[PDB]
Design an enzyme around this catalytic site. Structure first.
Site, PDB file in Angstrom:
ATOM      1  N   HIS D 137      19.238 -21.719  10.509  1.00 39.99           N
ATOM      2  CA  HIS D 137      17.874 -21.934  10.048  1.00 39.99           C
ATOM      3  C   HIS D 137      16.868 -21.524  11.128  1.00 39.99           C
ATOM      4  O   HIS D 137      16.087 -22.366  11.578  1.00 39.99           O
ATOM      5  CB  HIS D 137      17.685 -23.376   9.557  1.00 39.99           C
ATOM      6  CG  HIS D 137      16.400 -23.621   8.834  1.00 39.99           C
ATOM      7  ND1 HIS D 137      16.297 -24.535   7.787  1.00 39.99           N
ATOM      8  CD2 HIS D 137      15.157 -23.100   8.981  1.00 39.99           C
ATOM      9  CE1 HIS D 137      15.044 -24.582   7.334  1.00 39.99           C
ATOM     10  NE2 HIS D 137      14.326 -23.703   8.040  1.00 39.99           N
ATOM     11  N   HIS D 139      13.501 -19.451  12.557  1.00 40.27           N
ATOM     12  CA  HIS D 139      12.327 -18.612  12.355  1.00 40.27           C
ATOM     13  C   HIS D 139      12.139 -17.724  13.583  1.00 40.27           C
ATOM     14  O   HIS D 139      12.090 -18.205  14.715  1.00 40.27           O
ATOM     15  CB  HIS D 139      11.083 -19.449  12.105  1.00 40.27           C
ATOM     16  CG  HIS D 139      11.165 -20.367  10.929  1.00 40.27           C
ATOM     17  ND1 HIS D 139      10.350 -20.219   9.809  1.00 40.27           N
ATOM     18  CD2 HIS D 139      11.917 -21.475  10.699  1.00 40.27           C
ATOM     19  CE1 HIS D 139      10.611 -21.176   8.943  1.00 40.27           C
ATOM     20  NE2 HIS D 139      11.591 -21.949   9.460  1.00 40.27           N
ATOM     21  N   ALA D 170       5.927 -20.242   8.515  1.00 36.82           N
ATOM     22  CA  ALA D 170       6.314 -21.171   7.475  1.00 36.82           C
ATOM     23  C   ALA D 170       7.752 -20.946   7.004  1.00 36.82           C
ATOM     24  O   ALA D 170       8.392 -21.903   6.606  1.00 36.82           O
ATOM     25  CB  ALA D 170       5.359 -21.038   6.329  1.00 36.82           C
ATOM     26  N   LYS D 220      16.311 -16.147   1.611  1.00 42.03           N
ATOM     27  CA  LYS D 220      15.727 -17.479   1.698  1.00 42.03           C
ATOM     28  C   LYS D 220      14.731 -17.641   0.553  1.00 42.03           C
ATOM     29  O   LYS D 220      13.790 -16.834   0.433  1.00 42.03           O
ATOM     30  CB  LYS D 220      14.923 -17.636   2.994  1.00 42.03           C
ATOM     31  CG  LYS D 220      14.110 -18.917   3.127  1.00 42.03           C
ATOM     32  CD  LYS D 220      14.942 -20.216   3.108  1.00 42.03           C
ATOM     33  CE  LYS D 220      14.192 -21.475   3.511  1.00 42.03           C
ATOM     34  NZ  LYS D 220      13.438 -21.319   4.755  1.00 42.03           N
ATOM     35  N   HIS D 222      11.847 -20.150  -0.577  1.00 43.79           N
ATOM     36  CA  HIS D 222      10.974 -21.126   0.040  1.00 43.79           C
ATOM     37  C   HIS D 222       9.814 -21.431  -0.902  1.00 43.79           C
ATOM     38  O   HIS D 222       9.172 -20.515  -1.449  1.00 43.79           O
ATOM     39  CB  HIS D 222      10.450 -20.597   1.389  1.00 43.79           C
ATOM     40  CG  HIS D 222       9.914 -21.648   2.314  1.00 43.79           C
ATOM     41  ND1 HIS D 222       8.714 -22.367   2.050  1.00 43.79           N
ATOM     42  CD2 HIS D 222      10.419 -22.138   3.477  1.00 43.79           C
ATOM     43  CE1 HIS D 222       8.528 -23.246   3.030  1.00 43.79           C
ATOM     44  NE2 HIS D 222       9.577 -23.129   3.918  1.00 43.79           N
ATOM     45  N   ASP D 224       6.891 -22.079  -0.319  1.00 44.88           N
ATOM     46  CA  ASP D 224       5.615 -21.486   0.050  1.00 44.88           C
ATOM     47  C   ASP D 224       5.474 -20.100  -0.558  1.00 44.88           C
ATOM     48  O   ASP D 224       4.365 -19.610  -0.586  1.00 44.88           O
ATOM     49  CB  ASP D 224       5.445 -21.317   1.559  1.00 44.88           C
ATOM     50  CG  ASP D 224       5.242 -22.625   2.313  1.00 44.88           C
ATOM     51  OD1 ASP D 224       5.465 -23.737   1.712  1.00 44.88           O
ATOM     52  OD2 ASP D 224       4.942 -22.529   3.512  1.00 44.88           O
ATOM     53  N   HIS D 249      14.785 -23.859   0.333  1.00 41.94           N
ATOM     54  CA  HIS D 249      13.801 -24.918   0.506  1.00 41.94           C
ATOM     55  C   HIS D 249      13.078 -25.036  -0.834  1.00 41.94           C
ATOM     56  O   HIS D 249      12.307 -24.153  -1.213  1.00 41.94           O
ATOM     57  CB  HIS D 249      12.819 -24.494   1.607  1.00 41.94           C
ATOM     58  CG  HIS D 249      11.603 -25.344   1.824  1.00 41.94           C
ATOM     59  ND1 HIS D 249      11.187 -25.721   3.097  1.00 41.94           N
ATOM     60  CD2 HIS D 249      10.655 -25.810   0.972  1.00 41.94           C
ATOM     61  CE1 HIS D 249      10.061 -26.395   3.019  1.00 41.94           C
ATOM     62  NE2 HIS D 249       9.707 -26.459   1.724  1.00 41.94           N
ATOM     63  N   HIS D 275      17.576 -28.273   5.147  1.00 35.36           N
ATOM     64  CA  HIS D 275      17.004 -29.576   5.481  1.00 35.36           C
ATOM     65  C   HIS D 275      17.095 -30.480   4.253  1.00 35.36           C
ATOM     66  O   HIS D 275      16.086 -30.886   3.670  1.00 35.36           O
ATOM     67  CB  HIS D 275      15.575 -29.469   6.051  1.00 35.36           C
ATOM     68  CG  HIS D 275      14.704 -28.483   5.343  1.00 35.36           C
ATOM     69  ND1 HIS D 275      14.417 -28.588   3.990  1.00 35.36           N
ATOM     70  CD2 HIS D 275      14.112 -27.345   5.778  1.00 35.36           C
ATOM     71  CE1 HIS D 275      13.650 -27.572   3.617  1.00 35.36           C
ATOM     72  NE2 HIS D 275      13.458 -26.781   4.707  1.00 35.36           N
ATOM     73  N   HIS D 323      -0.367 -29.067   7.677  1.00 38.25           N
ATOM     74  CA  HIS D 323      -0.823 -28.851   6.276  1.00 38.25           C
ATOM     75  C   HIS D 323      -2.333 -29.024   6.194  1.00 38.25           C
ATOM     76  O   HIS D 323      -2.907 -28.883   5.117  1.00 38.25           O
ATOM     77  CB  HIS D 323      -0.044 -29.747   5.304  1.00 38.25           C
ATOM     78  CG  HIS D 323       1.378 -29.326   5.186  1.00 38.25           C
ATOM     79  ND1 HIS D 323       1.976 -29.092   3.964  1.00 38.25           N
ATOM     80  CD2 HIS D 323       2.305 -29.048   6.133  1.00 38.25           C
ATOM     81  CE1 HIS D 323       3.226 -28.714   4.167  1.00 38.25           C
ATOM     82  NE2 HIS D 323       3.448 -28.676   5.491  1.00 38.25           N
ATOM     83  N   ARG D 339       6.990 -37.639   1.182  1.00 38.56           N
ATOM     84  CA  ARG D 339       7.768 -36.609   1.876  1.00 38.56           C
ATOM     85  C   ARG D 339       8.510 -37.093   3.143  1.00 38.56           C
ATOM     86  O   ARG D 339       9.648 -36.633   3.391  1.00 38.56           O
ATOM     87  CB  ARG D 339       6.962 -35.325   2.130  1.00 38.56           C
ATOM     88  CG  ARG D 339       7.815 -34.159   2.634  1.00 38.56           C
ATOM     89  CD  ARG D 339       7.100 -32.824   2.682  1.00 38.56           C
ATOM     90  NE  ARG D 339       7.710 -32.088   3.776  1.00 38.56           N
ATOM     91  CZ  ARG D 339       7.464 -30.811   4.130  1.00 38.56           C
ATOM     92  NH1 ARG D 339       6.585 -30.074   3.464  1.00 38.56           N
ATOM     93  NH2 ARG D 339       8.111 -30.277   5.165  1.00 38.56           N
ATOM     94  N   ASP D 363      15.841 -25.231  12.539  1.00 44.37           N
ATOM     95  CA  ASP D 363      14.525 -24.965  11.944  1.00 44.37           C
ATOM     96  C   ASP D 363      13.555 -24.512  13.044  1.00 44.37           C
ATOM     97  O   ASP D 363      12.372 -24.884  13.023  1.00 44.37           O
ATOM     98  CB  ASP D 363      13.984 -26.165  11.135  1.00 44.37           C
ATOM     99  CG  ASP D 363      13.104 -25.789   9.948  1.00 44.37           C
ATOM    100  OD1 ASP D 363      12.450 -24.710  10.010  1.00 44.37           O
ATOM    101  OD2 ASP D 363      13.063 -26.576   8.957  1.00 44.37           O
ATOM    102  N   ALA D 366       9.315 -24.003  13.414  1.00 42.47           N
ATOM    103  CA  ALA D 366       8.608 -24.216  12.157  1.00 42.47           C
ATOM    104  C   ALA D 366       8.586 -25.705  11.838  1.00 42.47           C
ATOM    105  O   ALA D 366       7.541 -26.238  11.487  1.00 42.47           O
ATOM    106  CB  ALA D 366       9.232 -23.429  11.032  1.00 42.47           C
TER     107      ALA D 366
HETATM  108 NI    NI Z   1      12.044 -25.291   4.968  1.00 44.38          NI
HETATM  109 NI    NI Z   2      12.262 -23.528   8.053  1.00 46.62          NI
HETATM  110  O   LIG Z   3      11.647 -25.433   6.890  1.00 46.88           O
END
Ligand code: NI
Ligand code: NI
Ligand SMILES: [O-]
Ligand code: NI
Ligand code: NI
Ligand SMILES: [O-]
Lengths: 122, 570, 100, 570, 100, 100
Positions: D137, D139, D170, D220, D222, D224, D249, D275, D323, D339, D363, D366
């Site tokens: 995972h 970035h 992200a 991936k 995601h 977003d 995700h 995650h 955020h 969350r 992760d 990120a």
């Molecule tokens: Ni994620």
């Molecule tokens: Ni991530």
């Molecule tokens: O993430």
């Protein structure tokens, strides 16, 4: 004239979003037991199955809220939302696979909605 | 539904009529127009607009009008305007300035600016975005200078040198075919664009010309190699033939001639006049009179920029030390006096403001600071606003006219002068995607993100071991654009047409992008964007006082500048 | 913080100066790099305090005396240069023969 | 003659039945077997055994069964066992685990483990040796992250990004053919193994598929980018066809569906659930119910690992800041509450211990820490021993069962999930020689030596100017494995079969080793070593309480952890 | 010592903080990087002393006041983040508007 | 100054020692890298002051005691080595079990 580095002096006025597009208010219900939050630009008729509203009124539309914001429905919550009209070509692909084409295929979008069980296909 | 203009500017960056302060100066730029559709702005993140089926098109392959990269909500500051737009990048080039997103559902989408599966997103809302700076007076002395340049938003280095050799320490020159080759090979590992200058000196053509064929992008005439009538003439003859620019540092000593002799030798040919004010070198004391001629492209170096209380002591001292000048020897003292002049340094501030000096540049590591060309451009604009007030031409209370004039000095004008403006120098469609994002509070001081060829090369970013990128220490760092082979694709080596035609890249195994120098010999002062003024400049032989239109150009030094002690740890 | 490259580098002068001053306090005659670190760091701190180039040029000649440093050190140091941000921007200070 | 067992362990590392404490935890691993012949152990130095005519064979050329490299007396900790053996490496691969030396004179020599003239020696007596960690995972945000990863014993980075662009900040995504190419070129200078993930988003196949053909090793999905039914389906369709893994995700907002909708879209296809607990993102609040399905390969990210007193404040804050969430806005506060959940974070500790979550990952940069995947795995094992006690299955007072379960989470299981376990992920014959040596006192905290492809890439080592390597300052440094062209031979770029078949390496001039991603679509939970449990996980909609077999999974946060303040300068 | 990369880096925050505090002691209004260095270093030292994230979040808002810093500095600093090892592992601290 | 590579590096030991001593002064039991930094920096300062290798070998065993450091730290540190310039050149000091 204290200096704030990089500061803005924004001109006077207000910005009207989605101007000249038809708007429509509808009631919508989170019949689910988990929270649902809906983005400014998802084709409204394609949102979470468990949102109960008149699905027809979602077609070819999205939430009339500032770009990049979202409306929240807590579990059980019913509230009015305002919609605006999709623009550009008025076509939708993917998302929930209810449209995949012109938003004018009202009769087809709704049939697909009914069969997959989007609440409020009237 | 309406959004108040404060919230709007806070979420999306400013819109038409909003003003923004440049760092801690009293210069304000105002949004002239905005390409957006209000309610359809682009933005990225959870629940945001650039998601599949929504502002991100889910249908089209990369070839079908889709971007590699979208900068959302940039406030562009460029010679071409100060305005708000999305910027679309594809294959390393700027392909679209307008409105990005998905034509499925959005109005106003620029047709080749589709956000698709292939599309990366950079959020520029609340940033000011400029062209990378183009420094055309670089000595290649210490490779550490590159990051220094990146940190202040400079993306192209033109100049010369083989490292800390005396010739290189004095002159922007990489002499002869072998040196030029060695440096071209060196450039393969420098994460910035580079163009190399040969020695503009000799009395036969061949010794000069062979350097253009070897891969030089231009020549430098410098007094330390003999800025004589002969060298000036051969160099310009080579330049006219090869389509490359020539830069001059003339004969400060007036040994072979005075300014007028240099002009006769130039004989109306195009030439880039370096550190035109003269502190950095040139015919004592009148060099700056160069900046009035239609065939001279005039630049300043940065140590004189702008005129401050510590300027003269610093320079007097620098020079005397740098020349091994003893203060017991009266010729040394007379030399220094004739060369470091408050009268001309003061006027240089004003010639800048009037658009008579067209260009800035650093003179990195020889008599100027590698990372302060942008910094000092804006300090000069700010001093001038303070001393002369809003330019005649300003409107609505903004400084947009002054800002365009000034941003031009380190972006478009050096590109035009160098014959590389087809590639770089401005945020325009079809040019290489060299872009600098600034937080307005750091504007012109420290670049946030420097994009090279559409990939980030340099960023102010924090602890690499952290959960997010922002924890301390936030410092300037090389990014992936600079690593491995990506360094090849993100940077341009600029070369002469003839060296390109002769296969120098393949001969040497260069893998960087190769750009052609061209169109240098059929331009003049008139082509310097926002800075195209020609005029009789008189420098008084006795008092050194500078007249333009029979008015003396003079101003005070200031004790303090913006973009200084608020920002810098040393 | 947004440290630029020069900022990271010049942290090391301050640090060496602090090491040198601690060594002076223990009673040691200072060596070539120590001496240079102290005067350099002094110049930069002077600039930060708002002194002029002229001031620092005078003052820099009196931060250390030959009896602070090892034999030969005064003669090894002909001049010391540093650039720092004055209220009116970056400027260069040269101190000639700082230890007389 | 007999050697007392204390001296023995002191000279040669421990033997069968000895136990070793893992750093400052209360976890003890015990030697299950020992491949050696007592009295014939291998060792190197003056008067030692590996000398010509003695334990070093003087007859055989390199091809005749002789090693490039012998690690002597390693205490291996792997899913396949906890035991003592010499490890033989040749051509960058592990060729032998057993007993090295000279069959001229020694009993028990593994036949292809001859120490000959060609043989380099690494002394591992008194070290614990593991497979390099495999972080799936990542970035790609800041190139500095690589050394951070090496220092904690991570040797493969799978993930995506183009540097500190918002999309990359992200999501683990390198979008589209051009970005993927640029990063593949970038990878040429990163001294770690890399596999890149494309954007798992679109409603037509082609826009997705072209990224696999471009060289992506996986995709991936995601939220977003819109984790909608469509994107989930197309991506899995691409994945099934191309034989690559998909990571998800999911839609935290439940915008297009709830967890059950995501599962319907997945429709029983294989997918790597990122995650899985949900703090890092996913269907609020029930995402973690993913980890019960037979077709989900479940991983945690590290910031939640394990459940500590500062966990919730840190996360609540992180999220709200990340955020741009204002605390006056009740939807922001409701979002955050739904969350960040002590109920699920507590349970995640236990699901790990029960073998229900199969994998760790960082992760990096990120919402997770690049160098703390191994560190936090063992902190979790230790907390669980403290709170739940020795696992049912333990014996002889050791933690070997728990240790194998846990070491599997960051070694073999991510390799299996990613379809790269034919190359990496475990200390087994025929796999690439990615090995990490640990001093037991630094175990899981700071790697001593990191071996990449049979050469050291990274080491804690001291003053380079010293007479010996140990004088201060001892710090992490890149070694020769990383320098010049050796960086090519010591690292693997993992790519899709189709991009390999299409010649992407030659197209781009990649010289790293190229590995094939394969066998990702015909695995499940059942293939996760030591962590293969499927079960109905119920997350209470009202209280967020996690039941498995109708028992609530809950535990306390701890105020203090091992592998923390004893070790770290900040 | 076994310094990892983050450890080497974060030495520089401490160092800049020490430079900033020396400058405050001479009576100077602190600038943007100085201010940031001081608060950051404070957070990390807090973690090392064993405070909680919550404590450091409160405390960080009171290490410097607007009258410690140049005009505009308070407004340039919206938040400061640092990660340090608490007794219970690495954690992230965010201090919002540290100088009010 | 003419800093060579070892000189730049060893600045970081001094710096870590200063950070460690400040932490001791606040009353904290020192951790593994802190302890190592302090003893190392001490050795190098000893060399600079002109002590012999033999002196520093004795003295280094008494800079910190087990009650200065966290549990386990004494046992993690078996020896500490540093090279520094003595009056008679660079030499290597090894301190065995510095914390008894
Ligand atoms: Ni994620
Ligand atoms: Ni991530
Ligand atoms: O993430
Ligand atoms: Ni010059
Ligand atoms: Ni020059
Ligand atoms: O110059």
């Amino acid at each position: 004239n204290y200096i704030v580095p990089g500061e803005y002096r924004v001109a006077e006025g207000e910005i009207e979003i989605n101007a000249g597009r038809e708007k429509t208010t509808i009631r919508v219900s989170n019949t689910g037991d988990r929270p649902i939050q809906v983005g400014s630009h998802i084709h409204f008729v394609e949102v979470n199955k468990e949102l109960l509203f008149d699905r027809a009124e979602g077609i070819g539309r999205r939430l009339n809220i500032p770009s990049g914001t979202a409306a929240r429905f807590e579990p059980g919550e019913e509230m009015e939302v305002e919609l605006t009209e999709l623009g550009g070509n008025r076509e939708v692909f993917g998302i929930s696979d209810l449209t995949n084409g012109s938003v004018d295929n009202k009769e087809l979008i709704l049939q697909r909605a009914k069969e997959l069980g989007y609440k409020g296909v009237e | 539904m309406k959004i108040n203009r404060q919230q709007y500017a806070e979420s999306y960056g400013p819109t038409v009529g909003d003003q923004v302060r440049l760092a801690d100066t009293d210069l304000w730029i105002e949004v002239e127009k905005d390409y957006t559709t209000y309610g359809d702005e682009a933005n990225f993140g959870g629940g945001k607009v650039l998601r599949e089926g929504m502002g991100e098109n889910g249908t089209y392959t990369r070839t079908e009008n889709v971007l590699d990269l979208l900068l959302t909500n940039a406030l562009i500051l460029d010679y071409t305007g100060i305005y708000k737009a999305d910027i679309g990048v594809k294959d390393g080039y700027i392909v679209g300035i307008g409105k990005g997103g998905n034509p499925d559902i959005m109005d106003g989408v620029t047709p080749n600016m589709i956000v698709g599966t292939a599309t990366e997103v950079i959020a520029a809302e609340g940033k000011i975005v400029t062209a990378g700076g183009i420094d055309t007076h670089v000595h290649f002395i210490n490779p550490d200078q590159v990051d220094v340049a990146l940190a202040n938003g400079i993306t192209t280095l033109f100049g010369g040198g083989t490292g800390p050799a005396e010739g290189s320490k004095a002159t922007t020159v990489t002499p002869g075919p072998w040196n030029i080759e060695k440096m071209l090979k060196s450039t393969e590992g420098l994460p910035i664009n580079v163009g190399i200058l040969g020695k503009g000196h000799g009395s036969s053509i061949a010794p000069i010309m062979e350097q253009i064929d070897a891969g030089a992008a231009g020549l430098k005439i410098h007094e330390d190699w003999g800025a004589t009538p002969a060298s000036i003439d051969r160099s310009l003859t080579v330049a006219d033939e090869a389509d490359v620019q020539v830069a001059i540092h003339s004969d400060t000593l007036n040994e072979a001639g005075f300014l007028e002799d240099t002009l006769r030798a130039i004989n109306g040919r195009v030439i880039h006049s370096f550190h035109v004010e003269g502190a950095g070198g040139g015919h004592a004391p009148d060099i700056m009179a160069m900046a009035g001629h239609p065939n001279v492209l005039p630049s300043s170096t940065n140590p004189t920029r702008p005129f401050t209380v510590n300027t003269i002591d610093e320079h007097l001292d620098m020079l005397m030390v740098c020349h091994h000048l003893k203060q017991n020897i009266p010729e040394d003292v007379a030399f220094a006096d004739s060369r470091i002049r408050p009268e001309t340094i003061a006027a240089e501030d004003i010639l800048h403001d009037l658009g008579i000096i067209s260009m800035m540049s650093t003179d990195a590591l020889a008599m100027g600071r590698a990372g302060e060309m942008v910094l000092r451009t804006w300090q000069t604009a700010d001093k001038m606003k303070k001393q002369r007030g809003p330019l005649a031409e300003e409107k609505n209370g903004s400084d947009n006219f002054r800002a365009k004039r000034y941003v031009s000095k380190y972006t478009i004008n050096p590109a035009i002068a160098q014959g590389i403006a087809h590639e770089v120098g401005s945020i325009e469609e079809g040019k290489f995607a060299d872009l600098v994002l600034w937080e307005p509070k750091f504007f012109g001081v420290k670049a946030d993100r420097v994009i090279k060829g559409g990939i980030i090369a340099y960023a102010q970013i924090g602890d690499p071991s952290a959960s997010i990128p922002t924890p301390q220490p936030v410092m300037g760092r090389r990014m992936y654009g600079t690593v491995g082979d990506l360094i090849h694709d993100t940077n341009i080596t600029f070369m002469s047409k003839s060296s390109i035609q002769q296969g120098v890249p393949a001969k040497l195994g260069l893998k960087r992008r190769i750009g052609t120098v061209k169109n240098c010999r059929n331009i003049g002062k008139k082509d310097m964007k926002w800075n195209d003024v020609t005029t009789d400049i008189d420098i008084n032989p006795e008092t050194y006082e500078v007249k333009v239109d029979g008015e003396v150009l003079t101003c005070e030094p200031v004790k303090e500048l913006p973009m200084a002690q608020r920002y810098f740890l040393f | 913080m947004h440290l630029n490259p020069a900022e990271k580098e010049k942290l090391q002068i301050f640090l060496a100066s602090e090491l040198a001053l601690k060594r002076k306090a223990r009673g040691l005659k200072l060596n070539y790099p120590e001496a240079v670190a102290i005067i350099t760091s002094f110049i930069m701190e002077g600039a930060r305090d708002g002194k002029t180039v002229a001031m620092l040029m005078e003052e820099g000649k009196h931060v250390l005396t030959r009896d602070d440093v090892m034999e030969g050190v005064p003669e090894m140091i002909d001049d010391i240069q540093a650039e720092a941000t004055f209220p009116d921007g970056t400027k260069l200070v040269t101190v000639h023969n700082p230890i007389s």
